[PDB]
Design an enzyme around this catalytic site. Structure first.
Site, PDB file in Angstrom:
ATOM      1  N   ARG A  55       0.735  -1.271   0.029  1.00 38.91           N
ATOM      2  CA  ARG A  55      -0.144   0.055  -0.011  1.00 38.91           C
ATOM      3  C   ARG A  55       0.882   1.166   0.027  1.00 38.91           C
ATOM      4  O   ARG A  55       1.775   1.625   0.886  1.00 38.91           O
ATOM      5  CB  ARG A  55      -0.706  -0.152   1.233  1.00 38.91           C
ATOM      6  CG  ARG A  55      -1.916   1.284   1.212  1.00 38.91           C
ATOM      7  CD  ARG A  55      -2.926   0.869   2.295  1.00 38.91           C
ATOM      8  NE  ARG A  55      -4.221   1.574   2.417  1.00 38.91           N
ATOM      9  CZ  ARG A  55      -4.278   2.524   3.284  1.00 38.91           C
ATOM     10  NH1 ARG A  55      -3.416   2.839   4.088  1.00 38.91           N
ATOM     11  NH2 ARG A  55      -5.330   3.811   3.207  1.00 38.91           N
ATOM     12  N   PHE A  60       1.124  10.701   1.350  1.00 38.72           N
ATOM     13  CA  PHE A  60       0.824  10.084   2.574  1.00 38.72           C
ATOM     14  C   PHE A  60       1.847   8.994   3.313  1.00 38.72           C
ATOM     15  O   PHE A  60       2.635   9.560   4.148  1.00 38.72           O
ATOM     16  CB  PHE A  60      -0.534   9.614   2.376  1.00 38.72           C
ATOM     17  CG  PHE A  60      -1.213   9.033   3.607  1.00 38.72           C
ATOM     18  CD1 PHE A  60      -2.310   8.079   3.765  1.00 38.72           C
ATOM     19  CD2 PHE A  60      -0.626   9.521   4.873  1.00 38.72           C
ATOM     20  CE1 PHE A  60      -2.888   7.470   4.835  1.00 38.72           C
ATOM     21  CE2 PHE A  60      -1.383   9.186   6.240  1.00 38.72           C
ATOM     22  CZ  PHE A  60      -2.408   8.137   6.217  1.00 38.72           C
ATOM     23  N   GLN A  63       3.201   1.820   3.015  1.00 38.13           N
ATOM     24  CA  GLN A  63       3.025   0.738   3.968  1.00 38.13           C
ATOM     25  C   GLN A  63       3.455  -0.796   3.508  1.00 38.13           C
ATOM     26  O   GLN A  63       3.351  -1.152   2.107  1.00 38.13           O
ATOM     27  CB  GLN A  63       1.615   0.485   4.307  1.00 38.13           C
ATOM     28  CG  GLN A  63       1.326  -0.515   5.531  1.00 38.13           C
ATOM     29  CD  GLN A  63      -0.325  -0.337   5.697  1.00 38.13           C
ATOM     30  OE1 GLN A  63      -0.819   0.490   5.660  1.00 38.13           O
ATOM     31  NE2 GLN A  63      -0.722  -1.734   6.443  1.00 38.13           N
ATOM     32  N   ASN A 102      -1.752  -1.024  12.257  1.00 40.24           N
ATOM     33  CA  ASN A 102      -2.529  -1.780  12.782  1.00 40.24           C
ATOM     34  C   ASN A 102      -4.004  -1.866  12.495  1.00 40.24           C
ATOM     35  O   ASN A 102      -4.437  -1.405  11.589  1.00 40.24           O
ATOM     36  CB  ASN A 102      -2.487  -1.464  14.500  1.00 40.24           C
ATOM     37  CG  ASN A 102      -3.094   0.175  14.683  1.00 40.24           C
ATOM     38  OD1 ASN A 102      -2.420   0.873  15.264  1.00 40.24           O
ATOM     39  ND2 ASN A 102      -4.165   0.380  14.157  1.00 40.24           N
ATOM     40  N   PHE A 113       4.488   1.569   8.427  1.00 35.79           N
ATOM     41  CA  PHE A 113       4.476   2.460   7.137  1.00 35.79           C
ATOM     42  C   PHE A 113       5.383   3.568   7.394  1.00 35.79           C
ATOM     43  O   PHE A 113       5.979   3.890   8.373  1.00 35.79           O
ATOM     44  CB  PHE A 113       3.155   3.107   7.065  1.00 35.79           C
ATOM     45  CG  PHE A 113       2.614   3.694   8.189  1.00 35.79           C
ATOM     46  CD1 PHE A 113       1.833   3.104   9.261  1.00 35.79           C
ATOM     47  CD2 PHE A 113       2.499   5.344   8.426  1.00 35.79           C
ATOM     48  CE1 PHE A 113       1.185   3.949  10.339  1.00 35.79           C
ATOM     49  CE2 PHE A 113       1.985   5.963   9.452  1.00 35.79           C
ATOM     50  CZ  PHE A 113       1.426   5.477  10.215  1.00 35.79           C
ATOM     51  N   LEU A 122      -2.895  10.687  12.797  1.00 36.09           N
ATOM     52  CA  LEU A 122      -2.486   9.409  13.278  1.00 36.09           C
ATOM     53  C   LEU A 122      -1.787   9.351  14.824  1.00 36.09           C
ATOM     54  O   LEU A 122      -1.661   8.494  15.309  1.00 36.09           O
ATOM     55  CB  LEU A 122      -1.478   8.852  12.472  1.00 36.09           C
ATOM     56  CG  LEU A 122      -2.074   8.816  10.929  1.00 36.09           C
ATOM     57  CD1 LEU A 122      -1.012   8.234  10.263  1.00 36.09           C
ATOM     58  CD2 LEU A 122      -3.176   7.667  10.908  1.00 36.09           C
ATOM     59  N   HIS A 126      -1.169   5.360  16.251  1.00 37.74           N
ATOM     60  CA  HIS A 126      -0.054   4.412  15.637  1.00 37.74           C
ATOM     61  C   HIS A 126       1.060   4.772  16.254  1.00 37.74           C
ATOM     62  O   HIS A 126       1.547   5.825  16.679  1.00 37.74           O
ATOM     63  CB  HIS A 126      -0.064   4.681  14.114  1.00 37.74           C
ATOM     64  CG  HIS A 126      -1.128   4.343  13.408  1.00 37.74           C
ATOM     65  ND1 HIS A 126      -1.382   3.033  12.800  1.00 37.74           N
ATOM     66  CD2 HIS A 126      -2.521   5.062  13.076  1.00 37.74           C
ATOM     67  CE1 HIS A 126      -2.650   3.183  12.053  1.00 37.74           C
ATOM     68  NE2 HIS A 126      -3.226   4.331  12.437  1.00 37.74           N
TER      69      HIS A 126
END
Length: 165
Positions: A55, A60, A63, A102, A113, A122, A126
């Site tokens: 991903r 952004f 991941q 997660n 990531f 976040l 995270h």
């Protein structure tokens, strides 16, 4: 002691792109840092080597870390399967931040990531445990293989990984 340094040698459909090195904040999040370090060396008999970044979202994050299912649904920690959120001392302040992916509170496995921008939303969700030291240019290159929904145009894999310092 001193915080450990691990590396990832990235490839695009097998063609070597370059190396990205990370400093792991063992001084602030020792358990989370150790999980990533061990998975990077592959010393427990499993780890990141050969896995891919499933991903990647431009602007952004990138991941990866699913070495079991290789699709974003698997992966596991060196402590069994999942472990608790160690702490949220560190924040997603900008590009290069290394944080745990997660499936809600206390579900840390192996997925992580790399942020390519500040992602304050976040914070507290995270666990931040490291940051890019060398090779941010390689992370930016990987970013060009992503898409808005995260699907990568080519396979971005971790050809090799281990510990430097």
């Amino acid at each position: 002691m001193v915080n450990p340094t691990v590396f990832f040698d990235i490839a695009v459909d097998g063609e070597p792109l370059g190396r990205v090195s990370f400093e792991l904040f063992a001084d602030k999040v020792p358990k989370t840092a150790e999980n990533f370090r061990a998975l990077s060396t592959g010393e427990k008999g499993f780890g990141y080597k050969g896995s891919c970044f499933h991903r990647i979202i431009p602007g952004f994050m990138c991941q990866g870390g699913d070495f079991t299912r290789h699709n974003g649904t698997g992966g596991k920690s060196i402590y069994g399967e999942k472990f608790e959120d160690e702490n949220f001392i560190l924040k997603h302040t900008g590009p290069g931040i290394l944080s745990m992916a997660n499936a809600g509170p206390n579900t840390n496995g192996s997925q992580f990531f790399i942020c390519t921008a500040k992602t304050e939303w976040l914070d507290g969700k995270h666990v931040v445990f490291g940051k890019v030291k060398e090779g941010m240019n390689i992370v930016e290159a990987m970013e060009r293989f992503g898409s808005r929904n995260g699907k990568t145009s080519k396979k971005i894999t971790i050809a090799d990984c281990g510990q430097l310092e």
